[PDB]
Design a protein around this ligand. Structure first.
Ligand SMILES: [Zn+2]
Lengths: 1424, 35
């Protein structure tokens, strides 16, 4: 009660007043005071009081302590020192009570009450002073221990004030105690528990730290150092950490006075050994902290080196260690000028001193650790020098030469160093005893760096050994974060090698270690997400996709993944790689719902996710080490590395991950047929490997590049790359090729390394491909058998070596699945060669062996399984089995055809999600042949889905960037085009149900008055050109019409036409260099006549009667009625598959139906009664002659990689029609979508003739062209451009984007100043009139699809692209350009360009050699 | 008749996205306990 407490306080005050007036000893009062104290103790349970009450209690307590001291002083207790000691214990009891009261009041104290708490703090300071004053004179451990209890009580009260922000008051209370402890002599208080002293100093130091009195607090740290004078430096390791934190605050604030005061300057007279130990601890604490601490560490090492006496052997060891630290500092900072010694010189001197030192049988462990660290940092610094010299060499050069000069004795020497460091650390740590090192945290950090180095140089096994040692250290250190991280690293590495069981065990170990960590720290979130990612990967490997996808979706949806740290960025890379791994799976694996959920995250194609992973990795490289290691630009950037332990590991880890991601990108893109991008990534990786000087990765990427060059059919460059690989391998083993003919068990650098074995096997595979390409059979076959024999042996050696490394008893359940792709490719090549040789039964057995091999591994080796199924179907094929499935012919799985259809369906759904460019076309066209008119919609869909697949992949990737860049800036049309081009927009069902409704929707999207005709060649032996033409006509509100034209049985087959076209081009090349004028013109005339005959053959023999499937359908009802009658009338004459839509299209052109066409149509469509069918067809034509009238529509030609070369627009039937070309039907749909959303102004409004940019004679090689076009182009209104000079790229970008027309009269397609990437990086709003040579030509290299700049223009959104199909001369093309421009521009508004294109085709002298060259890509355009 | 020969119009002499800028590590808050 307040009044009651006041009355009690009044009683205490009155008692004190009476005691003051009491001269006679108040011994009885002291006894009464003890009773009052007892009452307070009983009330102490409650611990509730006001502030004046607490103040009055303090006053009464003061009198009690005074009486206790007075009694102790009085001879009564003066002689009875035990009574004086008991009096001291009584005062101590009062002190304990005071401490309890203060804690209770402080806890109850509110923010506002702090003012009274400050008054209480003043009393507490006086109490602490009284306690220390009483402590004075104490003798004996118990007396000093009692003094320690007084300090501990004060420390408890001090924390209360510290928490109450009364840091000044808290520091003041601690100051007296701390001052006494700081100024106390050594060994005065040996008993006092150090942690108690730490607590007391901690509060004051932190207070002095937070208050900003860092200077003042630093001095108390010296008193803190002085207080623990006899205490071991292990206790002193807390002041050291506190000190560096104090100095860091000065560094952040820019204060220099604190940095001036160092340890040698501070103590100035401690013993050299302890002073050096404290300097070492300070250096360790600095190396633990982040930010740039180069100069501070340099100063600490300088004083350490000064201390170490070189004459004394122990001083020699100390100097060796300090020289290692100095090498670490100099190895990333430009401090050589002050020290006049390079990092390499310091490390070599340190290594010499270490070799001189002999251990004392108790410091042998630290000797091992120091030698290992010195070797590792020697390697690191020499590698840094090599990288710097590589950057300088590439800067001066700013290829193919350094690539073969990597292996030098330096690599053997540089590596030996790393293996010696690993052996030393393994010897130190593998024994049971805990290593007796100074900082086991440095053994841990250096082991991490060594593992990163081993992974970077492509030695994963030694990295696994290092990580096991790191796990041992972390278990010994009782640090669970490091244990979990090391276990995650081991699991990821083991998954990369291909062993899932050991990965599962180490993932369980990681989770078990993860349970210990606090579930709030960021490290816990990192490790938990990493563990979930590894579990997702393991499920993906163990065919548990459903559960695995859920984990991935949980990982991706976790907001913690998008934090701003380098560890999170590295985690996201693996998330994207796992997304790619899941997206590479067929559709049968996961449900549609989960497929949509996975694709809704932002990545559609595996190549997209892998490219995003590559970009993130390079971004991390930029953030960590700058851009010198990636780009060789002169002084690109100079970001400091900022080495703080984790940065050093992350540098090497990111470099290794960039190399690995570049391998997956190259392999995946080359597998799909996209060889240009694959070569770009392969060359970027080779450049990186050249800078880093790593022969192993250079050999691997050189083999990949050789494979790509074989794919592009460039044997010379491929053989050059293979020779470089052979030199690198023969140098690596030293420091028919001889690396073959080895025992199944061997330990040569090549045999003990899985990476080198893979490189050798891939080399053998590519050499076999070259021999097969160069016509050398019986040798490529032998190399393929070598690969077949070698892959299982390498797998068994990898299994045995992993078993030896990880020390398990149970061998892995399955051999690592890392050479499965190589073996499957070898099987594919062997079966494909066996196709050519049906006589040899061995390859027939190889087909089945490969089929079992790929079927035993589902769904991993799906593309190779699809290839083997296609080859099996082709083998079962051997006038055809497809004749029964088509309505027109030239004039156990049930049956064979059904089994072929089932196998091809399995192959299709095995590759449909991410199809290779060639295999997809092969399967689609073969399946269309097998199906025919049995499933017309399926046949039409298959024929549509076999043209421009690489263009589809490139458009998907381009749409991702357009979406990513828009998201960065901030999309509906882009999403719709993505859905249109996606391989995963299908529903769930059996083939072809899902594929059909999709194609039916696409057909329903056709624009009105447009005919889409797809001309594809069916190939019965991949790598060749077939003689069967597949024609599919698509029109709105009309069922698709498909036909097959076998041209092989008759003379003049489509292959002969292609050969003649190639011969014409070759002869033109040769004739272009003739100096004579009378021979040049004769050759040109002969070639023109040959090409005219070729076009006539195209119209007459290649197509035949089926030339009317490309003409507009009649809008008059006559053909409809005639077809309606003739369907029923011809079903009786032997027409197996009646089609009204076919008859309607063919009869719409009854005027041009020659009697030979009618004869062929009747004799093929109705073979049982040919004469009668001919009679009815003739009667129908007679009724429809004249009655039909020409329509007004447009034709789009979709041709495969072999048919774009031929000039189809120049045929007599098509010479009076608007005909354009498009890569695919999906592109016409995309044009419709873009026009709907108003993103194509030219296709919507029209070309404005006042907006034209012209490039005329850039390099001044042509004078007739300039003299013919300069005045005409300049005189036009509103036309700008260049003439006589090359145009700047930012000019031509504006020309394409901000202009309606773009005329180019020069050499080629202008690729020198307008590359494909440049145009693809912008939106095309102009009609590109490229009048160069081969401007609209697609270069077909090998079996790859055609490549050219026209595809870039179309994917950029160009309305129409006009270009020449073959090389042209100058004067004739000048004539054609003049005619076209005059006719189109003088025709007034609303003039279609295609009509005048075909009209100006009659302008050149060589009508067919020059005029037939121009073609059109896109949609018709007209002026506004 | 035969005119002079005509000179040919032939010339006769994939981008890896530039690395993006990743944000720097977020300085994590540096815990004084009771007696
Ligand atoms: Zn060997």
């Amino acid at each position: 009660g307040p009044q009651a407490v006041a009355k009690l306080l009044i009683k205490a005050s009155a008692v004190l007043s009476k005691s003051m007036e009491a001269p006679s000893p108040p011994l009885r009062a002291l006894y009464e005071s003890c009773q009052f104290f007892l009452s307070g103790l009983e009330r102490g349970t409650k611990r509730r009081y006001r502030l004046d009450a607490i103040l009055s209690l303090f006053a009464f307590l003061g009198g009690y302590c005074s009486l206790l001291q007075q009694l102790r002083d009085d001879g009564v207790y003066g002689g009875s020192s035990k009574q004086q000691q008991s009096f001291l214990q009584m005062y101590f009891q009062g002190l304990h009570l005071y401490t309890v009261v203060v804690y209770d009041f402080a806890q109850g104290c509110q923010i506002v009450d702090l003012a009274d708490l400050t008054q209480l703090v003043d009393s507490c300071k006086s109490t602490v002073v009284w306690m220390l004053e009483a402590l004075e004179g104490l003798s004996g451990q118990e007396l000093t221990d009692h003094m320690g209890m007084t300090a501990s009580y004060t420390s408890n009260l001090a924390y209360s004030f510290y928490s109450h922000k009364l840091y000044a008051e808290a520091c003041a209370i601690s100051e007296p105690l701390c001052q006494h402890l700081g100024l106390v002599k050594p060994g005065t208080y040996p008993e006092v528990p150090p942690e108690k002293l730490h607590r007391c100093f901690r509060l004051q130091v932190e207070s002095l730290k937070k208050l900003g009195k860092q200077a003042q607090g630093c001095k108390m740290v010296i008193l803190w150092l002085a207080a623990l004078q006899p205490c071991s430096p292990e206790h002193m390791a807390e002041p050291v950490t506190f000190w560096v934190r104090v100095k860091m605050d000065a560094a952040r604030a820019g204060d220099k006075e604190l940095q001036l005061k160092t340890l040698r300057d501070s103590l100035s007279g401690w013993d050299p050994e302890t002073l050096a130990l404290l300097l070492r601890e300070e250096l360790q604490a600095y190396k633990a902290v982040r930010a740039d601490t180069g100069q501070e560490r340099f100063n600490i090492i300088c004083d350490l080196l000064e201390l170490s006496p070189e004459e004394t052997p122990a001083g020699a060891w100390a100097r060796a260690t300090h020289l290692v630290e100095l090498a670490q500092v100099l190895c990333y900072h430009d401090f050589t000028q002050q020290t006049n010694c390079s990092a390499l010189d310091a490390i070599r001197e340190a290594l010499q001193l270490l070799d001189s030192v002999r251990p004392e049988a108790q410091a042998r462990d630290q000797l091992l650790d120091d030698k290992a660290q010195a070797l590792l940092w020697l390697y690191i610094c020499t590698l840094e020098a090599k990288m710097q010299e590589g950057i300088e060499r590439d800067r001066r050069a700013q290829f193919l030469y350094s690539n073969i000069a990597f292996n030098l004795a330096a690599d053997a020497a540089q590596s030996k160093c790393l293996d010696q460091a690993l052996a030393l650390w393994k010897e130190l740590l593998t024994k049971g005893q805990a290593p007796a090192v100074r900082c086991l945290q440095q053994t841990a950090a250096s082991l991490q760096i060594l593992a990163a180095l081993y992974q970077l140089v492509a030695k994963p096994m030694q990295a696994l050994e290092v990580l096991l040692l790191l796990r041992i250290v972390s278990e010994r250190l009782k640090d669970h974060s490091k244990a979990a991280g090391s276990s995650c690293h081991i699991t990821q590495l083991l998954l990369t090698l291909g062993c899932p069981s050991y990965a599962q065990l180490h993932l369980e170990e990681a989770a078990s270690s993860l349970k210990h960590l606090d579930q709030t720290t960021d490290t816990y979130l990192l490790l938990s997400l990493t563990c979930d990612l590894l579990r997702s990967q393991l499920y993906w490997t163990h065919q548990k996709v459903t559960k695995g996808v859920s984990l991935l979706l949980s990982v991706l949806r976790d907001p913690a993944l998008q934090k701003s740290s380098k560890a999170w960025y590295l985690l996201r890379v693996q998330v994207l790689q796992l997304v790619a791994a899941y997206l590479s799976l067929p559709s049968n694996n996961l449900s549609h719902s989960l497929w949509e959920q996975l694709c809704a995250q932002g990545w559609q194609t595996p190549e997209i996710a892998l490219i995003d992973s590559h970009k993130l990795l390079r971004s991390i490289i930029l953030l960590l080490m700058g851009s010198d290691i990636l780009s060789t630009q002169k002084a690109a950037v100079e970001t400091s590395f900022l080495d703080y332990g984790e940065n050093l590991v992350q540098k090497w880890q990111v470099l290794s991950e960039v190399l690995s991601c570049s391998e997956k990108l190259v392999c995946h893109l080359g597998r799909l047929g996209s060889v240009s991008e694959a070569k770009a990534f392969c060359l970027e990786a080779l450049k990186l490997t050249t800078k880093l000087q790593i022969p192993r990765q250079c050999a691997l990427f050189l083999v990949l590049k050789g494979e790509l060059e074989l794919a592009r059919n460039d044997i010379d460059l491929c053989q050059s790359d293979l020779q470089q690989v052979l030199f690198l391998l023969e140098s690596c083993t030293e420091f028919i090729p001889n690396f073959l003919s080895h025992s199944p068990t061997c330990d040569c650098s090549l045999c003990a390394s899985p990476v080198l074995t893979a490189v050798c096997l891939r080399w053998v595979l590519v050499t076999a491909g070259v021999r097969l390409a160069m016509g050398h059979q019986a040798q490529g076959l032998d190399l393929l058998q070598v690969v077949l024999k070698g892959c299982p042996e390498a797998a068994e050696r990898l299994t045995q070596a992993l078993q030896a490394s990880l020390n398990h008893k149970t061998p892995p359940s399955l051999v690592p699945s890392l050479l499965d792709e190589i073996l499957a490719q070898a099987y594919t090549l062997l079966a494909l060669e066996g196709l050519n040789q049906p006589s040899n039964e061995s390859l027939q057995k190889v087909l089945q062996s490969g089929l079992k091999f790929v079927a035993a591994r589902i769904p991993h080796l799906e593309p190779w399984r699809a290839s083997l199924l296609l080859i099996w179907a082709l083998t079962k094929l051997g006038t055809q089995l497809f004749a029964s499935s088509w309505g027109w012919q030239p004039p156990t799985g049930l049956s064979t055809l059904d089994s072929i259809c089932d196998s091809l369906s399995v192959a299709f759904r095995g590759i449909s999600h991410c199809p290779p460019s060639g295999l997809y076309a092969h399967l689609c066209r073969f399946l269309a042949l097998c199906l025919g008119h049995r499933d017309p919609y399926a046949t039409a869909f298959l024929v549509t889905e076999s043209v421009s697949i690489t263009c589809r992949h490139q458009l998907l990737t381009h749409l991702h960037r357009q979406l990513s860049k828009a998201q960065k800036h901030r999309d509906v049309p882009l999403a719709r085009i993505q859905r249109l081009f996606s391989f995963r927009a299908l529903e769930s069902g059996h083939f072809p149900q899902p594929e059909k409704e999709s194609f039916q929707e696409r057909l329903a999207l056709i624009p009105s008055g447009v005919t889409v005709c797809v001309l594809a060649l069916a190939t019965l032996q991949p790598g060749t050109v077939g003689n069967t033409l597949l024609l599919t006509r698509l029109e709105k509100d009309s069922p698709p019409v498909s036909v097959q034209i076998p041209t092989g049985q008759n003379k003049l087959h489509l292959r002969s036409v292609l050969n003649e076209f190639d011969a014409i081009q070759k002869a033109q090349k040769e004739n272009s260099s003739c100096t004579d004028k009378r021979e040049w013109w004769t050759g040109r005339l002969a070639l023109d006549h040959r090409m005219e005959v070729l076009i006539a053959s195209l119209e007459k023999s290649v197509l035949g009667c089926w030339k009317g499937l490309l003409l507009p359908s009649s809008e008059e009802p006559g053909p409809a009625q005639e077809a309606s009658r003739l369907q029923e009338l011809l079903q009786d004459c032997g027409w197996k598959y009646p089609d009204r839509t076919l008859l309607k299209i063919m009869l719409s052109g009854a005027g041009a139906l020659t009697p030979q066409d009618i004869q062929a149509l009747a004799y093929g469509l109705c073979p049982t009664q040919p004469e009668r069918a001919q009679e009815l067809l003739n009667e129908a034509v007679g009724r429809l002659q004249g009655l039909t009238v020409p329509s007004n529509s447009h034709l789009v030609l979709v041709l495969d990689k072999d048919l774009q070369k031929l000039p189809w627009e120049s045929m007599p039937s098509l010479q009076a029609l608007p005909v354009t070309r498009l890569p695919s039907f999906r592109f016409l749909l995309s044009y419709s979508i873009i026009k709907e959303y108003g993103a194509s102004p030219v296709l919507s409004q029209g070309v404005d003739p006042r907006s034209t940019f012209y490039v005329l004679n850039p390099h001044n090689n042509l004078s007739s062209t300039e003299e013919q076009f300069r005045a005409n182009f300049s005189s036009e209104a509103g036309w700008r451009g260049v003439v006589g000079e090359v145009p700047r790229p930012e000019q031509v970008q504006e020309a394409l984007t901000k202009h309606d027309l773009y005329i180019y009269a020069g050499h080629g397609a202008g690729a020198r100043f307008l590359d494909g990437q440049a145009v693809l990086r912008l939106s095309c709003r102009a009609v590109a009139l490229l009048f160069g040579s081969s401007s609209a030509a697609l270069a077909v290299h090998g079996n790859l699809e055609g490549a050219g700049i026209v595809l870039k223009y179309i994917m950029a959104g160009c309305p129409l692209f006009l270009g020449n199909l073959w090389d042209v001369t100058d004067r004739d093309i000048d004539r054609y350009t003049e005619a076209l421009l005059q006719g189109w521009l003088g025709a007034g508004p609303g003039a279609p360009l295609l009509y005048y294109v075909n009209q100006a085709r009659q302008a050149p002298r060589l009508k067919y050699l020059i005029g037939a060259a121009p073609i059109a890509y896109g949609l018709p355009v007209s002026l506004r | 008749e035969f005119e002079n020969p005509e000179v040919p119009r032939e010339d006769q002499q994939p981008i890896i996205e530039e690395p993006s800028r990743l944000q720097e590590s977020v300085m994590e808050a540096s815990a004084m306990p009771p007696p």
